[PDB]
Ligand binder design. Structure first.
Ligand code: UTJ
Ligand code: UTJ
Lengths: 145, 146, 144
């Protein structure tokens, strides 16, 4: 099979940052897909499934409203045009402020027309809340249709 | 040299409804797959990957009893019945009432199935009044022959 | 007629408080060499595979302490029988008379597998599993 695919996971060695890596146990890059500057590089034109999941955790609810964001964006090689493909906002806290641990997952996915050389990023606003407790809760991937 | 495929997308102009479209970018319908009677028509017998995604948005949480469902069904050409292939239920609310915030909930379904020629697939939701087209974020239904 | 190893297993509605997978039943299947041994999918050949799973949790009202729901797909390597997580998720259905709640968990990805590898799809709270209707809980693979 010649189908361009990628399944990348968070690097535990770069805690405090969301750094994607093609880890030995459960991650990969195949059939031309590359991982450069924390981005997935598309080898050829066509429709692709782009999916992701990040998990936020904390202990108790502090001051004001904690806002959690997760965004998937595209950089086209032509005009270096950046566009938002998928995005979501979550507020984990609501009048707790005493403490008990909370969990907030963000999952995103969709089918998009990509061009050869396009770069995809999957970013978060609060890397300090990113959970590293288990092996495969935070991942980012592409599957050509 | 090519296999039957379909990637149909929901009509944003069909208010409070889930209406599928092939006549769009980037909607696909090839090698015998037909979009007929808001359903996908299987062109030949074999193994298929069936998948869908829907997005729900609610204005706030007046009660914790709000229930969201998304179901892919098979209407078999022979016996002519409606059987569930894939289904999911979600409760988007936990208390709230003070100001109310809009919520967003995606639902994903998909699997491999042995299908027969001429049988039909439907992808439905219980609350089409909650359906949304935001970036959280996509509404489609598709089949890929293996 | 496709030569690709594939599988689509569903939870047994007769296995109370257990998550026990069943095949070639209603719209379930095992094909082109995929086996079902000790509740795990046995990979028949080397290569890239699409792996996916869904589980549904139901509960009547929220009780004492915080309820945590988990769903995990694991890889047990043929050579050393080592068990590594491929995909995992955590959900909290309760946020502090009878009030039923519903929580679905869907996992999916692309993975390089070897011949002889075993795949499990497990949950922490089988007492909350909901298989009352048909396409509510499933596990499967498709070879690229
Ligand atoms: N080959 C290939 C491309 C590809 C891979 C996976 C899926 C898919 C599988 C199961 C569930 C889904 C839910 C939502 N969207 C997509 C889903 C669709 C297309
Ligand atoms: N068959 C097969 C493999 C597969 C199936 C479904 C998905 C998927 C689709 C849309 C959104 C997602 C968000 C988070 N994780 C997974 C998602 C990815 C891969």
């Amino acid at each position: 099979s010649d189908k361009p695919v990628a399944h990348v996971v968070a690097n535990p060695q770069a805690e405090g940052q969301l750094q994607w890596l093609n880890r030995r146990a459960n991650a990969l890059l195949a059939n031309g897909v590359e991982l450069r500057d924390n981005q997935l590089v598309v080898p050829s034109e066509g429709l692709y499934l782009i999916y992701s999941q990040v998990l936020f955790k904390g202990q108790g609810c502090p001051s004001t409203h904690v806002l959690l964001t997760h965004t998937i964006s595209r950089i086209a090689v032509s005009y270096q045009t950046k566009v938002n493909l998928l995005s979501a906002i979550k507020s984990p806290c609501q009048r707790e402020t005493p403490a008990k641990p909370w969990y907030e997952p963000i999952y995103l996915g969709g089918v998009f027309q990509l061009e050869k050389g396009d770069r995809l990023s999957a970013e978060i606003n609060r890397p300090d809340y990113l959970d590293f407790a288990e092996s495969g809760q935070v991942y980012f991937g592409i599957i050509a249709l």
